[PDB]
Ligand binder design. Structure first.
Ligand SMILES: *[C@@H]1O[C@H](CO)[C@@H](O)[C@H](O)[C@H]1NC(C)=O
Ligand SMILES: *[C@@H]1O[C@H](CO)[C@@H](O)[C@H](O)[C@H]1NC(C)=O
Ligand SMILES: *[C@@H]1O[C@H](CO)[C@@H](O)[C@H](O)[C@H]1NC(C)=O
Ligand SMILES: *[C@@H]1O[C@H](CO)[C@@H](O)[C@H](O)[C@H]1NC(C)=O
Ligand SMILES: *[C@@H]1O[C@H](CO)[C@@H](O)[C@H](O)[C@H]1NC(C)=O
Ligand SMILES: *[C@@H]1O[C@H](CO)[C@@H](O)[C@H](O)[C@H]1NC(C)=O
Ligand SMILES: *[C@@H]1O[C@H](CO)[C@@H](O)[C@H](O)[C@H]1NC(C)=O
Lengths: 373, 48, 112, 205, 114, 48, 48
């Protein structure tokens, strides 16, 4: 199937004999030549360590929240460590977080008990999920839970952290309620402090070291990320390499992680705008982080490949046609002696004739090729 | 219904365990869109 | 998996400080060592857990040091009522070296 | 006294550059052709407290820069943490500390976050979305002293400081030894018209 | 909060025996539990433990397959023994907790003789 | 393939995540039915 | 008022004041263990 263009035409046609004509066999896309990675240069070391290693984190209802910016996003060091019993990131995977790099990070920590770890997840129902903290049904982030018996739990009752046993309504995602106001049920007659069907919504948690796994201190830190439209300030420990211009390349500009060729851009970006887009919402520009310049991401050259041959009954000689590609970037065919260029594309294997004849194999753009002495 | 509408943010940042299903959802949607486009274009080409 | 109580027997005075060494063959799981004082004829009572954290309702004389493979207990003083064998309860990353283990006895005598 | 804000109040929804693109964005903007509260500061005349209501469009035209600060808090009277803005010649001051202020606080001629950065019309839009306090600006010159003229100058974002404190009330600071307009934002879809340079030359609501 | 054991008696070697510790004031569905033995002239050693989700799997290596632990109801947990030997003579305490324990029952001795 | 054909009955008896997934199945089915309707109408309108 | 059950059993008896806690599920006592024992999975309301 890939010995030569005639073999490819035979395979695609599913026949050992190929009639005279032009048959599309494959698509020729110029493969990337190298890899380039650019983002802000070693801005600062991230305090991610202080998120998990801090002495204390707040309760479930009044959960703390730290914001990560001007950081190095060293993620997989946390994944590799075996101390983290639960690391089921729902929106993403923790082994590839260093590859990408995001606009901002929220590292909010709240200690729930044991089996209630599964209660926090996109689209879950329970006590914590309804009354203390609900994660959005469309969640893109990690959940980093581990046993924390050695510090949080204490004998005789660890009542530091609390939770809302009764709430009048459900919880909107990422909403923190610290009202702690007495709630009435049934006929709601308790306008005072204490009354029938009237009790404090916050009953203290109980953690004892003599407790089972399902009812154990399980400290949880759930990182959250947002899609990259604004410039990204937290990006992982990746090696930055020199960019290339006018050369097709795999690029990772601030997490774009796409392929293409970077021509010079005559469009002027206003200083606040970072990224670019086309009429049809595809990336068509990018501001390189290190050097604040604009370089249009025109796509890597591609186009159909058509084998232009007479019948196998006539001859086994073929002439390929790289459609819509300038002949310079074709080599990235064995018969390189003669190369022709036309609006249809690089026509390799056929030699131009100044004379004109009736069309036999229609190439396109008003030129037709035939097999002739 | 996929977490992202760009391939690269799915292929990166996800492990195949769930990247398979996310990519499958996106493939089903885009194949439905392309099928709609080619059917509409076939009707329009019959008209033309 | 067996934890060695070195020395097996410890002798100390009322006003004399008490120290003991409990070594674990393998690393413990996230600082899960415990210590219980076993008076004769009765099950042991908790005195120190998670190496150094003090339970509620016990005297402020037991302090623990060490982590990983080596750990130690230090008691400031004895009121003659702490004559009991101490067992360092070694929690392990379970399914490796059993699931948890108990060491040998270490009773403290007071000379009067 | 009220006023008719013709078209102004349109800003760049996001830092994405689009060239010759009519990108329709649904976002909290200023509705077109809406009545606006007119306020006075000369002669006496003082400044009252106005609600926030998911964003306020503040357009103050000044000669000697009488406008000197902003207040954004649910209580803004030392009861709870409240955003505090003071614009000074030396620098720009943004605090969150609790301060007690009178009903008419005049200027002579715990803190959680901090930041340091009629020919004149300084347009501004303050809004709180996703816990983000976003500030925009525009300093286009105007030659009509009576009222803001017809036209369109877009607003460029300045600072995206994530205060994290809910804002429901709004107050303005002045100087004593000068009108200002206050609008409101509500969810309305628009159709921004981007230019070849990257500026939103026109828009329809 | 108290625990009490039962089932200690003289039984010939090679015969099965049932032990049981009961919880008073609390149910064996929140507080961790453990099963331990102490020979009259030998150190203390643990055998089995189960609470909350199925946790019976954790057993002593020397215990092997002749040791099983199961909670018949919420407040009582029974212990089943097989292949009794003279080296199995010890005092049986119902521990409360895997790595940390609060209080145990008085302890019922199970001597094995023929 | 959904739980029920009535949207309101799906909204009830179901917490919102399962509501999302079952309503997604129902939207896929009804959108397929509507695409089939408009395609058959395009073909029948070409015939007319 | 929003829940439905196949059947409901009403069990009436007389106990003194301090014996009310015995009728509470997961309790011990002379009344609970010898007079009227309740399941730990009890689903209902006790009135006195
Ligand atoms: C390092 O980082 C700074 C960040 O401002 C960047 O501008 C600069 O080019 C980088 N310099 C070197 C020597 O890598
Ligand atoms: C906490 O500190 C320890 C010190 O040994 C270190 O190994 C660990 O990585 C730190 N944790 C985090 C999350 O940085
Ligand atoms: C097959 O190739 C021969 C070459 O001589 C040509 O003359 C002939 O017309 C071809 N057959 C058909 C059916 O076109
Ligand atoms: C490359 O070929 C294309 C047609 O494929 C043509 O438009 C273009 O001018 C060529 N470039 C040069 C530099 O001749
Ligand atoms: C064909 O004519 C062109 C135009 O005059 C000339 O450049 C070329 O040399 C001629 N011959 C061939 C073989 O292309
Ligand atoms: C609001 O603005 C409209 C503009 O047409 C005006 O008719 C109306 O009277 C204004 N509301 C007032 C003055 O309260
Ligand atoms: C863009 O701005 C430049 C520089 O002020 C100006 O010359 C040009 O006319 C503007 N408009 C376009 C469409 O380029």
């Amino acid at each position: 199937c890939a010995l030569d263009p005639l073999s490819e035409t035979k395979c695609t046609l599913k026949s050992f004999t190929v009639e005279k004509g032009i048959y599309q066999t494959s698509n020729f896309r110029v493969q990337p030549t190298e890899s380039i990675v650019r983002f802000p240069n070693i801005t600062n070391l991230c305090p991610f360590g202080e998120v998990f290693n801090a002495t204390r984190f707040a309760s479930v209802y009044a959960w703390n929240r730290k914001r990560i910016s001007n950081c190095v996003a060293d993620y997989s060091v946390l994944y590799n460590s075996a101390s983290f019993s639960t690391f089921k990131c729902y929106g993403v995977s923790p082994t590839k977080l260093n590859d990408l790099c995001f606009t901002n990070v929220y590292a909010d920590s709240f200690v729930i008990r044991g089996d209630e770890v599964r209660q926090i997840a996109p689209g879950q129902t329970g006590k914590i999920a309804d009354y203390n903290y609900k994660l959005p049904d469309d969640f893109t982030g990690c959940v980093i839970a581990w046993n924390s018996n050695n510090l949080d739990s204490k004998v005789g009752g660890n009542y530091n952290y609390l939770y809302r046993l009764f709430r009048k309504s459900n919880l909107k995602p990422f909403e923190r309620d610290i009202s702690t106001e007495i709630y009435q049920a049934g006929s709601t007659p308790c306008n005072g402090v204490e009354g029938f069907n009237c009790y404090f919504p916050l009953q203290s948690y109980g953690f004892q070291p003599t407790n089972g796994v399902g009812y154990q201190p399980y400290r949880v830190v759930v990182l959250s990320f947002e899609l990259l439209h604004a410039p990204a300030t937290v990006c992982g420990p990746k090696k930055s390499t020199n960019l290339v211009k006018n050369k097709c390349v795999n690029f990772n500009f601030n997490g774009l992680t796409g392929t293409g060729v970077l021509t010079e851009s005559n469009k002027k970006f206003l200083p606040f705008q970072q990224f670019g887009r086309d009429i049809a919402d595809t990336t068509d520009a990018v501001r390189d982080p290190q050097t604040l310049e604009i370089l249009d991401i025109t796509p890597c050259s591609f186009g159909g490949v058509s084998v232009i041959t007479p019948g196998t009954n006539t001859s086994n000689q073929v002439a390929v046609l790289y459609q819509d590609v300038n002949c310079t970037e074709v080599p990235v065919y064995s018969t390189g002696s003669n190369v022709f260029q036309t609006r249809a594309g690089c026509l390799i294997g056929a030699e131009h004739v100044n004379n004109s004849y009736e069309c036999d194999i229609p190439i396109g753009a008003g030129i037709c090729a035939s097999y002739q002495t | 219904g996929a977490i992202s509408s760009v391939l690269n943010d799915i292929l990166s940042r996800l492990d195949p365990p769930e990247a398979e299903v996310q990519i499958d959802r996106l493939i089903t949607g885009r194949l439905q869109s392309l099928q709609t486009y080619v059917t509409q274009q076939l009707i329009r080409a019959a008209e033309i | 998996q067996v934890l060695t109580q070195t020395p097996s027997s410890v002798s100390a005075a009322v006003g004399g400080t008490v120290t003991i060494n409990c070594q674990s063959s393998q690393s413990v799981n996230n600082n899960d060592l415990a210590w219980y004082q076993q008076k004769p004829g009765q099950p042991p009572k908790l005195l120190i857990y998670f190496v150094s954290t003090l339970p509620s309702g016990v005297s402020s004389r037991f302090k623990g040091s060490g982590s990983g493979t080596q750990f130690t207990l230090t008691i400031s003083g004895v009121q003659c009522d702490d004559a009991a064998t101490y067992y360092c309860q070694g929690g392990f990353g379970c399914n490796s070296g059993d699931c948890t283990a108990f060491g040998g006895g270490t009773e403290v005598v007071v000379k009067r | 006294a009220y006023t008719n804000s013709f078209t102004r109040g349109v800003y760049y929804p996001d830092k994405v550059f689009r060239s010759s693109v009519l990108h329709s964005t649904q976002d909290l903007f200023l509705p077109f052709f809406s009545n606006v509260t007119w306020f006075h500061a000369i002669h006496r005349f003082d400044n009252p407290v106005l609600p926030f209501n998911d964003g306020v469009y503040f357009a103050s035209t000044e000669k000697s820069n009488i406008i000197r600060g902003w207040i954004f808090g649910t209580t803004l009277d030392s009861k709870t943490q409240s955003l505090l803005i003071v614009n000074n010649a030396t620098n720009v001051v943004i605090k969150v500390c609790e301060f007690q202020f009178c009903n008419d606080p005049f200027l002579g001629v715990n803190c959680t976050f901090e930041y340091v950065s009629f020919k004149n019309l300084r347009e501004f839009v303050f809004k709180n979305i996703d816990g983000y306090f976003k500030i925009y600006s525009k300093h286009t010159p105007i030659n009509l002293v009576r009222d803001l003229p017809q036209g369109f100058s877009a607003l460029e974002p300045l600072v995206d400081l994530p205060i994290g404190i809910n804002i429901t009330r709004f107050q303005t600071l002045l100087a004593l030894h000068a009108a200002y307009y206050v609008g409101y934002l509500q969810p309305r879809t628009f159709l921004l018209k981007y230019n070849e340079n990257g500026t939103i030359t026109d828009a329809v609501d | 909060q108290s625990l009490e054991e039962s089932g200690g008696d003289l039984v010939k070697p090679g015969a099965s025996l049932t032990l049981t510790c009961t919880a008073s004031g609390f149910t064996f569905s929140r507080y961790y539990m453990s099963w331990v033995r102490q020979a009259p002239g030998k150190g203390l050693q643990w055998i089995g433990c189960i609470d909350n989700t199925i946790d019976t799997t954790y057993y002593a290596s020397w215990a092997k397959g002749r040791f099983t632990i199961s909670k018949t109801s919420s407040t009582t947990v029974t212990l089943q023994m097989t292949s009794l030997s003279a080296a199995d003579t010890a005092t049986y305490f119902c521990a409360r907790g895997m790595v940390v324990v609060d209080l145990w029952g008085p302890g019922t001795l199970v001597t094995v003789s023929s």
